[PDB]
Amino acid sequence: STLVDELESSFEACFASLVSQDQEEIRTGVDQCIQKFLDIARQTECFFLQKRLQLSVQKPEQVIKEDVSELRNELQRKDALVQKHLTKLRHWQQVLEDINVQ
Amino acid sequence: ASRIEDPQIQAHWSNINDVYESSVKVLITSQGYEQICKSIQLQLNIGVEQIRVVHRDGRVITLSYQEQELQDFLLSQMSQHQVHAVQQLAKVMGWQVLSFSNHVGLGPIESIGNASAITVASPSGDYAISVRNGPESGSKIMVQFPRNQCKDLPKSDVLQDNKWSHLRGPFKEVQWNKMEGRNFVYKMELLMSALSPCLL
Amino acid sequence: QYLCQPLLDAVLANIRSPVFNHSLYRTFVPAMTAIHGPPITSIPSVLQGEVARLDPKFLVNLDPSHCSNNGTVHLICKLDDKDLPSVPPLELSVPADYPAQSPLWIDRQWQYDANPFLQSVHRCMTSRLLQLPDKHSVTALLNTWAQSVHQACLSA
Amino acid sequence: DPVQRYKMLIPQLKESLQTLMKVAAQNLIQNTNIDNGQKSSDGPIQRFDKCLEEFYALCDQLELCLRLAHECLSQSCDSAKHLPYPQYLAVIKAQISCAKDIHTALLDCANKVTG
Amino acid sequence: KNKLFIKLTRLPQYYIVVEMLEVPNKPTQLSYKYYFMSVNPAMALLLQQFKENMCAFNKVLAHFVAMCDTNMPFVGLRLELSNLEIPHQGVQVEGDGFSHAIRLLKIPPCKGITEETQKALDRSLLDCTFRLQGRNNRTWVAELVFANCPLNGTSTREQGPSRHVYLTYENLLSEPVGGRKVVEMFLNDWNSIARLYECVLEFARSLPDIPAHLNIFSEVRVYNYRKLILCYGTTKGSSISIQWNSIHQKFHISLGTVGPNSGCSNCHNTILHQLQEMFNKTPNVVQLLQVLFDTQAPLNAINKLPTCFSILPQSSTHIRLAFRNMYCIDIYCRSRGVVAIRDGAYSLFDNSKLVEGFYPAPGLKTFLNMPGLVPGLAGSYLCSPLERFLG
Amino acid sequence: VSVNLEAFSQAISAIQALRSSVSRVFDCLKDGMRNKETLEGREKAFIAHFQDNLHSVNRDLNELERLSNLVLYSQLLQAYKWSNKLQYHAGLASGLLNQQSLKRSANQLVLPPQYVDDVISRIDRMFPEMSIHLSRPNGTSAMLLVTLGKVLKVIVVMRSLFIDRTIVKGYNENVYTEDLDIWSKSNYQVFQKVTDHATTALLHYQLPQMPDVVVRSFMTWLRSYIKLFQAPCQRCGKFLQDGLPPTWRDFRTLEAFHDTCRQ
Amino acid sequence: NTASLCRIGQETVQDIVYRTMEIFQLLRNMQLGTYQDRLTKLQDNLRQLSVLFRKLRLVYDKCNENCGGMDPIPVEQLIPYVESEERREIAEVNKKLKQKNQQLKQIMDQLRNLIWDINAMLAMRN
Incomplete structure (x- = not known):
């Protein structure tokens, strides 16, 4: 009956x-x-x-929406990483252009 | 990394190299289960003429400059990581591991890598799963249905009691194709949940 | 031995006395019950299991044809495999007290004759029974039958 | 003293066991001789019950001595494990009390969240 | 003279011999012959040849090596099972193709167990499949499957009549994978399982007829065929565990507190030894539940005393309480919720003081709370709580 | 001292055993013989049980004699007891729960050099046999020279508070002591196998987040290689092939092992 | 929607045990300033743990009350044995990520070549 209640009771008993x-x-x-x-x-x-298995085998569209969201998040993360890398590269390019001089 | 996408592949080249040496850190995880699936890791030493492989299980192998050797070795390591994934999943799920063989010798004579073998049982008795992956012929999974549940096994008159009608019986095979999930571990977990208590 | 011996001697004296317990009883009842207080507050099963744990290739059953139910248990099982099979009955007589007197296969050569494949399966399965260790089981005979049929397939 | 007493009672405990075994043998032999046909003297006899209670009394005295010594030794080791002395005991009791407050807080929160 | 000796490191004394021969028709090809050698100044014992079934892998060589490394450990186990008169089926290919297993038919029945319990056990053992697993291939697991479980538990173990217990054995690094100690430990666990099945059968037979107070006072929780975890208490907090230790050949009980209402302990840890001996003399669990139900209420009061007062645990239902060094009192618990207190240092015989001595000056306080040392009783578990601080 | 505490605890059990064993001898005698289905069987059973009970009394008495030779305020003691209890309970609980973790994924570097220096110094403080020399010849990536007695000279290559490469060398061998010989070999096969096993231990000891316990365990496992050339194979004799005793020390079990034998 | 709420319920029950493990580790490391930090950390852990209980409870109620029309088939009758515009969007995103991954692979190859060159030169300069 409401396994959530039983797991709550076990978590309470571990402290009981x-x-x-x-010893x-x-x-x-x-x-x-434990x-x-x-x-x-x-x-x-x-x-x-x-x-999850039932919902995927009988309603295979929400999983597709999840894949779409995950791919978009991955693309955004890649874009942010490449932006940070470009900033660091431009900084080091300016630093190296400063040196090498006489 | 581009061709084979099912298990995983990773590489972290070392910072400092030499003119006659270098090193990488190969890891073969799963797509979703990165934590638990951390049983196979490699550390290649690319020498001047030989590539030295140090596996996590204390196995050192000296490969050659030939390209195929490395490809076949990595394929066999992925095949072994595939069964290690099922083993580590049966640990977390609690599926009692009945048998585990890293290099099985029963079956068809296999390709470059030796086949792997695992067999686990459901926590509630009757149900059980078995997995055999290999570099050439792999993903041969078959569930062990209990007796008196298939209703297609030929009965015998020698069996005159109902107590013997509870053992795990007909050994039905499952098609790994046309399944759900995306990674071997996703499908394995979905199959384990399907053969679970369905408490809902 | 030490510190206990006369008690030992005493009880070793008085075994086979019929009144014995009572004497013990008497001299040991009160003090203990004062101190500690009141008292306290058809077919054998092994064959059935061997049958239940066979490979689904076999479909073992009983034998009501010959004279049975007086001596050993006779079985006509089957061969149901993708590989072609040797003559199916392989009548097996499992005697009582199974963990001894390994069962014997009642030979039927007339059906295994008139055919080269059947003669070959008979020869190889007989040789494999000769090489089988003593006190073999029923599963052993079934497996050696199957592998002998397979050897006859691969030979011809 | 506790070790010394344990030494003092051990010879007595061996003596009490010897008498209890010997008295039991004499009583059983007399009772068997009366129950079967066998003449025996009334004699002093000595009751088995008195000896069995004496053995138990010595056993309790030994256990009480050892239990006290074990408790005293355990307390001393713990005391060592945990400038003026009044402020010393004050900061010790303060640490213990704050640990107890943490205990009570965790207990009440984990018991009010569920169950 | 052109041969290779591939030694098996996991299972020693076994050597594969791979010899190469020139093929006459093709001067650019070779033929391989594989033999199974064994060694005991090395002395060879037997030789047999397997002849049936990029190009540098030599698939059949690795296949034969893996087959040998997987099969040979089972031969020693089969020999050990045959040497101890244990009827076992030969090494069989399991239904899932790739495997090896040694399914036992009958176990040696037992030593020290009644005949009817032996029959009840032998008619419930369905399968005793042994299998090999673990890295280096040296772990064995036996899956016993019993039917008609006597009594269930509170956990989700009320499924179909098939209880599966897995017993694992890992021999030492030496004493190779196939040895005597594995089957010896297996027989020891089987004996413990039988000696515990004795008590579970007794309890299952006594379940229909219960004094009707222990039924609500105690409940069975788990039955893993090697441990009995009963739980008692008003809120089902305290727990007792029954197990047979084959090393000492005696029942071992372990007490704990599992429930969200209790003291700081099981409250029965002061009578653990006398309860051990009590269950060892007469292996009956209903007597254990009865004495626990009778002695819990006085123990809850006698445990809260300041620790001055010293608790000397005597025989069961005879807990002794003593002062700093000159006073004593005996606690005699009985059925129907009554405790009889005594003068303590007084002697139940000729009026002489004990080693502690110092006759208790009062004793009439106990009278108004409930020579002159005979018997003070009739405390209905409330005097047992107040008289603590009062005395 | 702790040894005295154990002797007293063992003795308390021995007194309890003696009393219980004496009660058992008398209690069994009171019940007397049982039928046993046979005249010989009943006589044998009674004699065997009585003799076992009599022997147990002798054994328990002997242990007590032998054990003799070996050996506002109450709230404070209550707090001490509760602290010990919580320590033991939380230790056991953390062990049992981190042994079996249900975490399956993470999705739902920069480090100060002085911090790495402090960690290395703390690790060097323990294990007095080992001596670690910090040096940064090439960048922030630290290179550690670890001397273990007259036995080993390990070359750990940190890229961060992370172990990347290890090359152990012999004590008599030269690490060149200067600009550090990161890339070389020991010229002895035993030390090469030890380098392989050290890389294996590195690949084994890999904690995900905390970067300190990994180095702690690596140094502890290296310290086990101080009984090299002097300890058995616990399966093999001193020189299994001709590699020394233990090229291998089991992780979680600092026992020597030959790589050819197993593990 | 519901298939993602189920994954949320999965991650919550996978994280609650880790939170309890962290709480156990914190109680273990609490030996007798720093006490205040340990106390507030334990309290924050307990509050976030109760929030996780509430979240898992509500997602449980959601997945139980949903029960979409397409669930007449019980379990074990679904496993396959032997014997539109969303797909277009998926294909477009796949082509885009493939191009981006090829570009990122080129970038990584160039970075690896740069690092190897710098390391070789700085090693041979000695």
Whole structure:
């Protein structure tokens, strides 16, 4: 029931030992809470991946919009990088033109 | 880098070189899973006549000035990184790795590189996947459906109980073509989610 | 040995006395229960598994034709593979107490004759049974049958 | 003193075990002789119960001594691990109190966010 | 005299011999013959030849080398399984083409386990497939698949009647991949699984008839066939774990706190040894739940005392509390929520003081809160809380 | 001292064991013999269990004798205990959670030279056997000469607070000491294999963001090469082929290994 | 739209565990000025973590309430076994990025040649 609630409860339980009012006890406790949190996190990831697979196999247009946006962002990033490189190149060109003199 | 685009390729040439030596840092990642897919990395030493390769697994190989040798070696390394990607994905997903062989010897005699092999099981028992990639013949994935689920296996009268009708059975193959995602790891993750609990 | 011996000697004296426990019981009931307190608050399964874990090439079944259900378990399985097959029945008699008395294949040469391919598969599979180790399993016979058929294919 | 007491009780504990084993053997032999047909003297006998309680009493005294020594040693090592002395204890208690405030803050926030 | 010796570094003593011969018709070609040699002043043992199946890769050579390196580790495991009278199927090609596996049929039943539990286990073991994995190819994994699980857990383990447990073994660097220690550890884990299946079967049989307080007090959480994690408490916070340690041949219980309401500990860590011995003498879990439900309430009060007061753990339900060095008191917990307190230093026999001595001056305070040392009882778990600070 | 604390903790368990073992001998005797399906079996079972119980009492008593030879205010102690508890708990939790990380991608250099110098000096402070000489002959890219005893002379080539190339050389060999011999070989096959293994360790120890623990682990792994020519193959004898003991030291396990043997 | 909200939900659940790991590391590094910095860092981490809970919750509600018309096919019935203007925009963007990548490859080749030349000259000058 609302795996979000169960993962919240496990994240609370991982803190339920220190936040309260020898080594083996804390050892086994952290083992249990951490492994439970990891399992339920991997399960929520599996649910999200199933939803993605269904939406992609039945509605393959939003993925195309995502590819378009990603390609445009990549092009903008490349343009910005080449602009910065050109600025540095012009700076170093002026610096080298200053030297070499007598 | 331009021709082969599926797994990845990367190169970071060193800052200081010499007149009789140089060095690069080759990395073969995946498109989306950069973090987990960091198992194969190379450090080439381009000498005057020989190229020395130092793999991350402690394997040193002295190549030649010939161009093909390097191409075939990089293709075999990509083929191995392909199965290492499935291994590292089955770790994060929690798919128990049943078997893993870096150089398998069963099957068709393969090309320049030896074939790789992995077989993982679903966390909830019944389902299981197997992957065999190679430089010449690769992407041979087949899912292991459970018995009493295909309904096409010939029954036997020797089986007189219903307890034996739960084992993973008919070994159905899956077409890697006409699939979703974009990278081998995307399709592997989508197939793993398809064979998941479907809690929705 | 040390510090315990007379107790040892005492109990080693008094085994096979019929009244024994009671004497123990009596002298040991009160103090303990005072101190610690009150008391406390058809077909064998191995063959079925071997069948369940076969390769889908085989379709093993029981044998109601010959005299059975008194001695061993007789099986006519099949050969269902893309490679062409040797005569399918290969009747196998798995005796009781499976982890011993390795099963024997009841030979049927008349069907394997009248054909060169069948004679070759018979010869090679028989030789491969000769080279098989002692106490072989059913899966071993099935696999050597398949590989012998394949050898006959590749030879001719 | 704690190590010395542990040394003092160990010979007594060996003696108490010897008597408890010997008394048990005498009692079992007399009870078997009465239960089967075998004449035996009434004698002093010595009760098994009294010996078994004595052994337990010595065991508690030893455990109490060791538990105190272990607690005292653990406290001393921790004290060493953590100019005027009053200001010294003041800054120690201040650090401990601020750590406790951090504890309470993290606890209340992680418990109010969910559950 | 023109031959190459390709030694296998992972599995030693095995040498491939590749000899080259001149072909008569073509003076510009060669023929390769591959032999499988083995060594024990080196002494050869046997020789066999495989003869069936850019141009400088010699595909068949690498293929044969990989095939040998992948197959030979299984031969030692097969020999070790045959030497210990363990009926096992031969090395078979798995359904997914490329593989090797050794599926066991029957295990040696057990030592020290009842016959009916042995039958219940042998009728539930579906498969014992062994497989090889790991870098250098020296890790083994056995996947046991049991059916008809006795009792489920709170986790998502209530699926179809097929529970899959994976047991991994990695032998040392020496003691080559096929050895005795792997199957020995496997048999040890199987024995522990059987000795735990004893208790799980007892608990599954006793589940229909429960005193109706332990049912709400305790709940089963996970069952991985090698550990039993029961959880008890009013808010289901505390947890006890059952496991059989084959090294010591005794049950090992581990206590923890998993729940968003509890003290600073499981509150039962002061009676851990007596509970260990109690479960070791009589392996029954319902008695454990009962004694835990009976002793938790007094323990929650006896744990909060200032640590002056010293807690000496005696036998179960007999926790002892002592003063700095001259006073004592015995805590006798019983069913129906009652605790009987005693004078302490007093002796249950002839009136002489113990080593601690110093007869408690009062003792009538305990009377109004609930010679003259016989029995002070009838505290209904509230006196057990107030009388702490009062005394 | 800590050794005394452990001896007391072991002794407390030994007293508990002696009391439990003595109770077991008497408690089992009270139950007495069980049927066992056979006359011989029942007699043998009772004798075996009693003898094991009697022996356990002797073993537990012996340990206690042997262990004798070896050995506003309360809130402060509460704070100390909670600090120790949080330290242990957070350490275990961080270990267990960074061992298994679910991060799959990043998308959802410039560094001060004095900072690199400080990091190198901090690393040189520990490992007193190793001596690292900082030098910048060519640009901000630093070159480190690391002397390990009379054994090794490693040439690390930093491009940033990052390890790029390593060439170990022998102690008697000349690094030329001046404008640094970055490009050369050791002329001995053992040191060449050690250079290969050092490049392998570099490719292995690669943390994504933090550039300090990588150098820490590299220096720690190099320090393991101080027992070279003196330690076994833990699978092989001292000279497996003729390369020395361990051209290889396992990462996560500073054990010697021959490259020909494995790892 | 929904297929991107699902990727957002994926990245949120992939990042929450990393945030908890960073919180654990911060509590571990907290041994007894700097205390104020550690406290405010922990508080900011907790606030961003609660914000991540809210975000993952809302995207969960969104993907659950969406349930588009095209979902009658259950899972395992979708995997393929053996036995318009958007595409034009994709092709145009592909051609553009291909040209830009060829130009960037030329630039990288020139830069590598420059660096190799400078290194060789500054090495041989000695």
